[PDB]
Structures are given as C-alpha cells and as structure tokens.
Amino acid sequence: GTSKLKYVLQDARFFLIKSNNHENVSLAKAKGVWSTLPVNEKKLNLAFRSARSVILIFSVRESGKFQGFARLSSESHHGGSPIHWVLPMSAKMLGGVFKIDWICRRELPFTKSAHLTNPWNEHKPVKIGRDGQEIELECGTQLCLLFPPDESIDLYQVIHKM
C-alpha cells in the first residue's frame, strides 16, 4: 503493498462523484475521462491547481457501493472526441472533459465504510453526499485504503505525473 498508494494520496484532495448509471462509470473506466456539470467543473479545476493529487471517488446512485477511484491528470478541456454519456439532458450541459488515471477499479460496499464520517458534510457517513461533495483528507484517505487492492494497476506512472 500500500506504500505507493499512500504516497499518491499524501496531502491529496478527495471528491465524491455520483453517477446516475453504471454505463457512465464503465465509459470512464475504459476511456480515462470524466465530465460533470459546470458547478463541479469549476470546483475540480480549482482543486487540480491547489493540490498534489485530486481524487474522485465514484458511486453509482442506488448501487449501495463505490465503483473505484481515480486521480485527475488534467483540468477540464473542450473539443475532444465526443463521449456518448447516458445523460439524465444534452451534451451542451456538461463542462469540459477531465482526463483521469484510475487507481482502483474494484468496488467497495457502503457497508464497509460505515465507520467513516465526513467533517465537510456534517460528519454524516462518507457514503452520504451530493455529487461533487468534498471529503476531508483523513476520511478520504481511509476510504481509499478500504478498497480491495487493484493488482492490475501500477502506480509508478501516476507518481511521475505528480
């Protein structure tokens, strides 16, 4: 192992990302991209400049689980290859596209994070939060450390982007 993972998470910022469907998380895992509404896009761009790592922790609404977590590798940018998201809307509602590097593509059930509370959301269980809710450093670090190890990922290349 967990040492390189701990290094990547050192002094990181963490954000809860809530997807309405599994399809969008599958696209994000395959293409290494995410897009959000402008309110969250602005917050994520500010955070990307502010911190050594910005971590998105993903949860599909109604799934009872997190589906993994990823590190922003860029600010949002427009005009790339269009992404066929399943919109709740139009592609014009979204902000830009963020490039992300997955750190863990394995699931974590909410039942396993019941002992973690988020001070930035009234110390409610970390699973509770609107899309874009920031997770305080200690809570977010412990949450990421709860996920099963993803032995398919090598954090060597992610470390070099820091």
UniProtKB/Swiss-Prot annotation:
Regulator of alternative splicing that specifically recognizes and binds N6-methyladenosine (m6A)-containing RNAs. M6A is a modification present at internal sites of mRNAs and some non-coding RNAs and plays a role in the efficiency of mRNA splicing, processing and stability. Acts as a key regulator of exon-inclusion or exon-skipping during alternative splicing via interaction with mRNA splicing factors SRSF3 and SRSF10. Residues 12-147 form the YTH domain. The YTH domain mediates RNA-binding. Changing residue 85 to D: Does not affect ability to influence alternative splice site selection. It is found in: Nucleus; Nucleus speckle. Changing residue 56 to E: Does not affect ability to influence alternative splice site selection. Coiled coil: none annotated. The lineage of its organism: Eukaryota, Metazoa, Chordata, Craniata, Vertebrata. The chain holds residues 345 to 507 of 727 of the full protein. Changing residue 34 to A: Abolishes binding to N6-methyladenosine (m6A)-containing RNAs. Abolishes binding to m6A-containing mRNAs. The gene is YTHDC1. It comes from Homo sapiens (Human). This is YTH domain-containing protein 1. Interacts with SRSF1. Interacts with SRSF2. Interacts with SRSF3. Interacts with SRSF7. Interacts with SRSF10. Interacts with CPSF6. Interacts with KHDRBS1/SAM68. Interacts with TRA2B. Interacts with KHDRBS3. Interacts with EMD. Interacts with RBMX. Interacts with ZCCHC8. Tyrosine phosphorylated. Changing residue 19 to A: Does not affect ability to influence alternative splice site selection.
